[model samples]
Target: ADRGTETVPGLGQRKQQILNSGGGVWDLAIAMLETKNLGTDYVYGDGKTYDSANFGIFKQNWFMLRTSTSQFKGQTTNQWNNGAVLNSNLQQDIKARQESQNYYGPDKWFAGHRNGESGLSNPYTQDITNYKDAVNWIHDQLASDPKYLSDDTRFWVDV
Candidate 1:
């Protein structure tokens, strides 16, 4: 006999939990960069924030940095939270990006608009659309350099 909804269990309450953990290392890096650049904020499409969809690659990079052995190998999360490791790694990452031939200003990396509509974009030149492109461009630059191959592989996962 096919059972009808006889004595079926009631649905559970539609409860949602949202945790407010403190910001991660990448947040600190962005803050430092913003301060260094004299309060010039990264501009995405109008009204876009850091957690917006276009910053997905940047988010992934943050996750990879936390999980991978590239920067703070063998260091626990506590160690990373001590500020020293975070600062050192942040400086290193920014320095490496700056030294790359593909390196553009922070605006291009953090907030480049689609079709090169950013402030740093030239009408005659193609520019990165977002952090994803910026990160990939830096990775491509590092990929061509044999010296960083090992560390780079640990930092960037192939998708």
Candidate 2:
């Protein structure tokens, strides 16, 4: 009843509870990511509204949490969020595809990012369709305490 205007404070516990059945946090993370069926550019909504002009609820690149606040271990590269953000840029590959086709504008390029190939084929979608693979990448980073990776799936979930 007293969830002040701050952190909602219970997901890690709930997630832990769910996994008490026996699995590593990494296992739980991959399971959640895989089942999420997330599509391009997972978006955060501002409520009263949605993630973006295009990324609405249950759409590609669409996801959100309601009535909550959060915190994460952003103190180090090992922190999940930073690592994942840095990795999921996906732009380099997008740029490469654009290069082969002789078109170059961040706008059109971004179109390729979300819509893919004439804004229809959605080739970039292939880059992250599984979604769980991205989660697994971040999980490996944290679980190993390894040097930060500089590639796809940069955000971390602690998930």
Candidate 3:
């Protein structure tokens, strides 16, 4: 943690110092938190790249096209480019993990986010109506195409 650089006992010292110096107190224990596994992925390189056991291509696409690019709703070309980025980047992230297997820094943080920490995605900063419209727009784009997200999955497909 930011307080304890290595040992768990160092964490206790920080807590004691905070109390001894009469600093403000609040909940800081790990047990108070709830966690979930969010999963990870990268983009498709070759057709063979899609077969890795790490995560399937569909998962990669969802994380990229929806989780990654949903905010860029006004930009379809960007959305398209993002698909490429996903294939490339996932290969990078997975390779990095396998190579050094470095368990530190952004990787840890990214894992946390991937695990579904709710506050990371803030609804207060989002325009709900616009997001709904954007979702509809994306559905409409795919609805006309036979390749992705079948008509049953399309929003208002029943209409």
What is the descending TM-score order? 2, 1, 3
Candidate 3: which stretches are off by over 4 Å? 1-115, 120-124, 127-133, 145-159
Per-candidate TM equals: 0.22, 0.26, 0.19
Q: Write the per-residue lDDT of candidate 2 for residues 15-82, one digit (tens) a residue.
A: 44434533344543343332232122344321213222122111221111110102111132222132
Question: Which has the better TM-score: candidate 1, or candidate 3?
Answer: 1
List the candidate numbers ranked by lDDT, top first.
Answer: 2, 1, 3
Residue-by-residue lDDT tens digits, candidate 1, 72-140: 334443443322233224344433233321343444434332222233344224333333443444445
Question: What lDDT would candidate 3 get against the real structure?
Answer: 0.28
Model 2: how far residue 110 lies from native, Å: 26
Ten residues in sequence with the least summed lDDT for candidate 1: 11-20
Q: For residues 64-129, write the lDDT of model 3, one tens digit per residue.
A: 223323332234423333334433343332333222112223333233222322313442323433
Q: How many clashes in candidate 3?
A: 4
Residue 8 shift from truth in candidate 1, angstroms: 66
